[PDB]
Amino acid sequence: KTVVVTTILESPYVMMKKNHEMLEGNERYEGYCVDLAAEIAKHCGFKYKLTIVGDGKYGARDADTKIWNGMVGELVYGKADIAIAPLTITLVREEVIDFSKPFMSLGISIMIKKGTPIESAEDLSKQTEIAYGTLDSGSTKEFFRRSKIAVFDKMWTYMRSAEPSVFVRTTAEGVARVRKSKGKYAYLLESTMNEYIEQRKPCDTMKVGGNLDCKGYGIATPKGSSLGNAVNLAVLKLNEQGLLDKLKNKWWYDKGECG
Amino acid sequence: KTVVVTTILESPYVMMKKNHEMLEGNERYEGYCVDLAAEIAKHCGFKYKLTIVGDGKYGARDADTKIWNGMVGELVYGKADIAIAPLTITLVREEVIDFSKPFMSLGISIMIKKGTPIESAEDLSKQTEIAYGTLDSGSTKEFFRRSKIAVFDKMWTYMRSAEPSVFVRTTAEGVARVRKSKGKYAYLLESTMNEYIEQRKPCDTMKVGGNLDCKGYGIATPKGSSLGNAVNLAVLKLNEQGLLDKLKNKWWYDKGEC
Ligand SMILES: NS(=O)(=O)c1cccc2c1c([N+](=O)[O-])cc1[nH]c(=O)c(=O)[nH]c12
Ligand SMILES: NS(=O)(=O)c1cccc2c1c([N+](=O)[O-])cc1[nH]c(=O)c(=O)[nH]c12
Numbered sequence: 001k002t003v004v005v006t007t008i009l010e011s012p013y014v015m016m017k018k019n020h021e022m023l024e025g026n027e028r029y030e031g032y033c034v035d036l037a038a039e040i041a042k043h044c045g046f047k048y049k050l051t052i053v054g055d056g057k058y059g060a061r062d063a064d065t066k067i068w069n070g071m072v073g074e075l076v077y078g079k080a081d082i083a084i085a086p087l088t089i090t091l092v093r094e095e096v097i098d099f100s101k102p103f104m105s106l107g108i109s110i111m112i113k114k115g116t117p118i119e120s121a122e123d124l125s126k127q128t129e130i131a132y133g134t135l136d137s138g139s140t141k142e143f144f145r146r147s148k149i150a151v152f153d154k155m156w157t158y159m160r161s162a163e164p165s166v167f168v169r170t171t172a173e174g175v176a177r178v179r180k181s182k183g184k185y186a187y188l189l190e191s192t193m194n195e196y197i198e199q200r201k202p203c204d205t206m207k208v209g210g211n212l213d214c215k216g217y218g219i220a221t222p223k224g225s226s227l228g229n230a231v232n233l234a235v236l237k238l239n240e241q242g243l244l245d246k247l248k249n250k251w252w253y254d255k256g257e258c259g
Numbered sequence: 260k261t262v263v264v265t266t267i268l269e270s271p272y273v274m275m276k277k278n279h280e281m282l283e284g285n286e287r288y289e290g291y292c293v294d295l296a297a298e299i300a301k302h303c304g305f306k307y308k309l310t311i312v313g314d315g316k317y318g319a320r321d322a323d324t325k326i327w328n329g330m331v332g333e334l335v336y337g338k339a340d341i342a343i344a345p346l347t348i349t350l351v352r353e354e355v356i357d358f359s360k361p362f363m364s365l366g367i368s369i370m371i372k373k374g375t376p377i378e379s380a381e382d383l384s385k386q387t388e389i390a391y392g393t394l395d396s397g398s399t400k401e402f403f404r405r406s407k408i409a410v411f412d413k414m415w416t417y418m419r420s421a422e423p424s425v426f427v428r429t430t431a432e433g434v435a436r437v438r439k440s441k442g443k444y445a446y447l448l449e450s451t452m453n454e455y456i457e458q459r460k461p462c463d464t465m466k467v468g469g470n471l472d473c474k475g476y477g478i479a480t481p482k483g484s485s486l487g488n489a490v491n492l493a494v495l496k497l498n499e500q501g502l503l504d505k506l507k508n509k510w511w512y513d514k515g516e517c
Contacts, residue, residue, distance in 0.1 A: 094499065240353065
């Protein structure tokens, strides 16, 4: 009867509480997805146990081994009943798991150090004194590689052959590069993470311009789950009631540090 | 049995065949949503009758009367079983009907007359020689009114008080305005429609820049429908199989004129 929820340590979605070793079970954790899991569980009427994905991954098919890793793998291989995490809805994942309606929308966005004279992707594309880049792997890099929109193709042509490399290995590294680069590096990343960091001390970064594309995070269940329909209904209702917007404001802005 | 499908005459989703007068039933119509209805019906295993919505509307709640009009109304009040049309997924509609996963994604986009020196919303926002606007009502105007993104707020502040009015009553009026203005009017509208018109003679308009926001069209059923889940599974499968991409290319590009 107890539903196993797989999730991932990613701020502000799921974080260890400061006193987690004194605590046990679900009370060890806090965050946007901790709150959302409680609301989903209420609407669907189940008891649940939050469990952090063992490999700290979201989920992809290991191309060497054909085996799914991450939270997706935990669902496919029967170890968890539901994933409640910032897990991107993608076609390759939809082949092996089901997603709810998105509970959060997002897109590629521009992070600058405050004071940088950049307002848009167009601004970046037409210049070079301010370097700009993405994660060295993953879907943000791929969006630019594949784009046939003129501005994003212009940007990809610059990034792919820029020296020294404008790509970074982790999000932390891209954010640190923005902060340390005295206005001469801009970093392309998820709007949600960009907005979160804009509310973190030292309050020296800023999101500029509109989002470049459209994606969503969804609640995932194994195919054939007795839960898929109730979960989708719960996301719909929570969205309609403003609960998702309330949780976003809680974890990004009420708990933000930059006013 | 026989599922009543409500839809709307909107190119290239649903159109009268040139020879519709000789024809009857579903065979009078052609288009992306006609083909999609046939595929959904196949995957779900039902026979169906296509019917054009009586009042020619998508669906809104008459704020005076509480009564839903359009295809949404036909679902809510039991006159149709499923809507297969370019019907936007919105929260106020989700309160009274169910939507599938989106079968088409779209967003606000910029139409220019070819030769116009504009590539982006930022380009429009920084000048005035080229007027630009939206429909006089609806969600594109609301997007600009409500936006807190600097560039779109700048565009709204310009549009709301621009003289003469930059707004238009119909999309036909906006496209004709672009075409007749020798490059001094640009029109903000749905990317899907912009892309369609770009492939139509006289081949004098163009979509520039990326989309400004994110929306979707979905298949709609009344709440509690025995069809909602099968319809959703069918959209998922048709998307995964590439059929939706194939139909888009058919009606926008294989059948394009440019
Ligand atoms: N700190 S980060 O820039 O944004 C970030 C960087 C890189 C990959 C991310 C990711 C985030 N995220 O928002 O938490 C979620 C997420 N979800 C997935 O499903 C996936 O495959 N990859 C990711
Ligand atoms: N520029 S337009 O593009 O010709 C167009 C103009 C105005 C409203 C539209 C609309 C389209 N469309 O794509 O067909 C679909 C649609 N669907 C709805 O549900 C709704 O409420 N309003 C609309």
